Amino acid sequence: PTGLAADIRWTAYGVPHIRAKDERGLGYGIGYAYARDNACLLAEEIVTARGERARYFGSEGKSSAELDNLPSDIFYAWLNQPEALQAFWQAQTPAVRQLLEGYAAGFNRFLREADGKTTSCLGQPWLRAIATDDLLRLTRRLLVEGGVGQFADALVAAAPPGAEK
Amino acid sequence: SNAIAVGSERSADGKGMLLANPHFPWNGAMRFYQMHLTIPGRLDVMGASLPGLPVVNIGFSRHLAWTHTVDTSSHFTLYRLALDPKDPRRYLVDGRSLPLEEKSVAIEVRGADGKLSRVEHKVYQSIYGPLVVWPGKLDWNRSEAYALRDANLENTRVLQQWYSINQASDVADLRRRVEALQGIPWVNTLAADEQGNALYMNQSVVPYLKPELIPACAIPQLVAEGLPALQGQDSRCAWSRDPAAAQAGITPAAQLPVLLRRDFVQNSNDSAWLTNPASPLQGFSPLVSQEKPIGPRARYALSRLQGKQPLEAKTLEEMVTANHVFSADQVLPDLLRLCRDNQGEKSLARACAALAQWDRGANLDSGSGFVYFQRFMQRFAELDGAWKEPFDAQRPLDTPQGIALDRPQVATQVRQALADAAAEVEKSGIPDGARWGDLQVSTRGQERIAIPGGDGHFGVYNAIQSVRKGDHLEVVGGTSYIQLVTFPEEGPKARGLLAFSQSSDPRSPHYRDQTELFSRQQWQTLPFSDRQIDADPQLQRLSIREAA
């Protein structure tokens, strides 16, 4: 009966003011408003955080963090393994789960209806419906920016010695 | 990132005031986005957030404003492993040989032909975390390897933490909420409230070692070089447990720097030490905060903040919009003296003229002196003992200063550095008469918008980082979300800009509008109350719903 609902006002420069009666509806408004302005950005960064850059863009490209696509993918595939996402989700409060559920729904609602007015990547195969796991992937990517994220190339490069002298 | 919080004892109105000036990328996964969130009766907060996060990261509410700066604390440790001499895939802990774990990741790769191929790659892991290699420094040979333990990998509290901050009423409340959860990954927090409290917190997620463990568990040569490296062959060098900490192995909130004052607190990415020099923060773990010389941005801020005169909103605003290159205060007077001592040196003529005319700023209209100065400073910074007054721990706000021109060796080397810098600049294709704004730009469609500001390492508070792209310097990061908050009777007054504009999409009406304003350094109101929002002539509204 209640579901997801949000009221959005935009003031000068396109700043959204989102009103809702709960976290789910709040997330809904945030995801919708953000998609209107930045759907392609989020879709690209989700591809990165899923470790699927080489799959869509090949090995000769880089992420927006200027890591090569294949080493980036190996790193985020390692970072965002299913067990790790599951554990992170399980540890979330109802409020935060609801924020994330709403955000994904609102982003996806914009995507369903978009006709390109503010979205340049319409029709690209990497522009697609997102899930709460994708938002967890982004969160964990930002989480480690002050730690192992700074060693992503170094992690990929780590292999035992052979028989050298 | 810069941040300044001002309290009742120094603000012109006797209330709290906060300048937020984070320096972050202009593209990608850390591109700030403005939004205002309201659940009537229990949440009402406005500010900016990072992509994908359903919370406000830097912002304000009815009685409180807060922001963040990247801290100097370590949020991981390296462990040096002692490898089993029989097997480089095994390592020794307490004299016992343990196997590395191997986990393969499978990646799909799109080829030339457009077909997908599968790549399988082994990621080796120790009890501490994954192995890492920096060739020539952190190798994996038959004797040693390095593993990395990231303290935030187990921080499941990070979203909850800003959800909680978003609900904070005042500075005291904010402090309770942060110390309770300890979910902040790697930034300081600075805040001010209407009652006139100014708060600094170095409250983040930091590996914990009990004091008596640190001399024994450190790798001396690596920590001396800035790496948080520990002895991985001793089980006693595991991160220490304290039941008071919100996460096993991290530093409890009571042992992390906090300063609550009514005059001011500031940070520009140095340690907690000189947040406010009248009350230095010392005596913390080296993993947390150390007494190191402060950078020129903080030194600049302190030079404006110290004293007895009231601080106005316009004062804090103009600390950003002045674009003053504070590093020039330290070295340009003596550099100009050197110039005057070397008239007749034809090669130095243009450079010395430019440096002399220069307004010592990174403004759009600042002359070529800025470019000459940058190239010189880059070379100056690699000279040895060229400061007239070296860093002095008892005078950390006023040192280093000046050039040691009375030492013949220094004089010769500095002149050479200027000579070298001059030739480099003149070797570039930059037309005579060019000003800084002609060079540093942000591209929007077919236009290049001139962007004021310059690199933080030269002491420009309005820090802007650029890279060469063809004939120009393209901005990649720096001043981003700007928020300046005061608390007049009617409600919070917030002023600022999102420098790169709301939308990354060229199709958007909000792709370049704030960027043009940033170019002109014209900050704007951030409407927060229903009355402010309704006063907006361009107000748009949409209500949306769908079944769950």
Chain B partners within 8 Å of A36 (Cβ): 503
Q: For CA atoms B179, B186, B10, B20, give the dihedral sign.
A: negative
Distance CA A111, CA B384 (A): 58
Nearest neighbour of A118 by CB, restricted to B28, B155, B505:
B505
Q: How was this structure determined?
A: X-ray
CA torsion B128-B131-B134-B139 (nearest 10°) is 100
A15: left (phi over 0), alpha (psi -120 to 50) or beta: beta
Residue of A16, A71, A68 lying closest to B133 (CA atoms): A71
Residues A148/B150, Cβ–Cβ less than 8 Å? yes
Q: Give the CA-trace dihedral at B374, B377, B382, B386, to 10 degrees.
A: 170
Q: Which residues of B are identified as catalytic?
A: 1
Q: Are B130 and B146 in contact (CB under 8 A)?
A: no
What residues of A are in contact with residue B106 (Cβ under 8 Å)?
A: 77
The structure tokens listed for B184 are 């902040």
C-alpha–C-alpha distance, residues B239 and B208, integer Å: 5
Interface probe, candidates A23, A36, A148, A165, chain B, greatest B C-beta count within 10 A: A148
Main-chain phi, psi angles of A150, to 5 degrees = -75, -10
Residue corresponding to tokens 């959800």: B163
- A–B CB contacts, 8 A cutoff, strictly below: 297
Which of B91, B121, B239, B515 to probe the A interface (max A CBs under 10 A)?
A: B121
Output the furthest CA–CA distance in chain A (Å, rounded).
71
Residue partners of B97: CB distance under 8 A and separation at least 6: B84, B86, B87, B90, B91
Packing angle of the helix pair B327-341, B369-380 (nearest 10 deg):
100
CB contact under 8 A, A37 and B498: no
CA angle, B280 as apex, B277 and B282 as ends, to 5°? Answer: 155
The beta strand positions in B151-238, using DSSP E, are: 187-193, 198-201, 229-231
Read off the amino acid at residue A53. Answer: R
Q: CB distance B43–A144 less than 8 Å? A: no
Q: Which CATH superfamily is domain B1-75+151-290+475-536 in?
A: Aminohydrolase, N-terminal nucleophile (Ntn) domain (3.60.20.10)
The residue among B216, B171, B380, B206 whose CA lies nearest residue B290 is B206
| Antiparallel, parallel or unpaired: β B264-267 and B2-6 | antiparallel
Give domain limits for chain B: 1-75+151-290+475-536, 76-150, 293-474
- Which chain A residues touch B103 with a CB distance below 8 Å? 78
* The pair of three-digit structure tokens given for residue A57, joined into one six-digit string: 């863009």
Which of 1.10.1400.10, 3.30.365.10, 2.60.40.420, 3.20.20.70 would CATH assign to domain B293-474? 1.10.1400.10
Tell me how far apart the alpha carbons of residues B464 and B320 are, in angstroms, rounded to a whole number.
11
User: Which CATH entry fits the domain spanning B76-150: 2.30.120.10, 3.30.360.10, 2.30.30.30, 3.40.50.2300?
Assistant: 2.30.120.10
Question: Which amino acid is located at B542 in the chain?
Answer: L
Q: CA angle, corner B27, sides to B21 and B33, nearest 5?
A: 55
Instruction: Measure B207 CA to nearest chain A CA, in Å.
Output: 11
**HEC-encoded secondary structure of B83-134:** EECCEEEEEEECCEEEECEEEEEEEEEECCCCCEEEEEEEEEEECCEEEECE
- CB-CB under 8 Å, A106 with B513: no
Instruction: For residue A142, give how far its alpha carbon lies from the nearest alpha carbon of chain B (Å).
Output: 8
Token reading at A40: 């392609």
Contacts of B478 (CB under 8 A, 6+ apart): B23, B24, B26, B453, B456, B462, B463, B464, B465, B499
Q: Where are the beta strands (DSSP E) in B325-426?
A: 387-389, 401-403
Q: Using CB atoms within 10 A of its CB, is residue B467 exposed (0-12), middle (13-18) or buried (19+)? A: exposed
Q: Which two tokens stand for residue A8?
A: 């959005």
Nearest chain B alpha carbon to A14: B510
Asked if B505 lies within 8 A of A21 by C-beta distance, the reply is: no
Chain B positions touching A92 (Cβ under 8 A) are 156, 159-160
CB contact under 8 A, B123 and A155: yes
Contacts A21 to B, Cβ<8 Å: 39-40
CB atoms within 10 A of CB B116: 12
Which CATH architecture describes the domain A1-165?
A: Orthogonal Bundle (1.10)
To the nearest 10°, report the CA torsion of B92, B94, B100, B101. Answer: 180
Q: Which residue of chain B comes nearest to A138, CA vs CA?
A: B52
Peptide bond into B488 cis (omega under 30): no
By Cβ distance, the residue of B109, B150, B536 closest to A70 is B109
User: Residue A139 in contact with residue A50, Cβ under 8 Å?
Assistant: no
Give strand pairing partners of B20: B3, B483
Which residues neighbour B255 within 8 Å (Cβ) at sequence distance 6 or greater? B208, B284, B285, B288
- End-to-end CA distance of chain B, in Å? 40
Q: What are phi and psi of B441, to 5 degrees?
A: -140, 165
Q: Burial-class residue A58 by CB neighbours within 10 Å (0-12, 13-18, 19+).
A: middle
Topology agreement, domain B1-75+151-290+475-536 and domain B76-150: no
Please work out, in degrees rounded to the nearest 5, the angle formed at the alpha carbon of residue B88 by the alpha carbons of B85 and B91: 75
Residue of B43, B465, B502 best to disrupt the A interface, most CBs of A under 10 A: B502
Chain A residue nearest residue B161, CA to CA? A96
Of B207, B155, B127, B128, residue with least CA distance to A88: B155
Q: Do A45 and B28 touch (CB under 8 A)?
A: yes
The answer to whether the CB of B90 falls within 8 A of the CB of B97 is: yes
- What residue of A is the nearest CA neighbor of B138? A154
Output DSSP code: residue B361: B
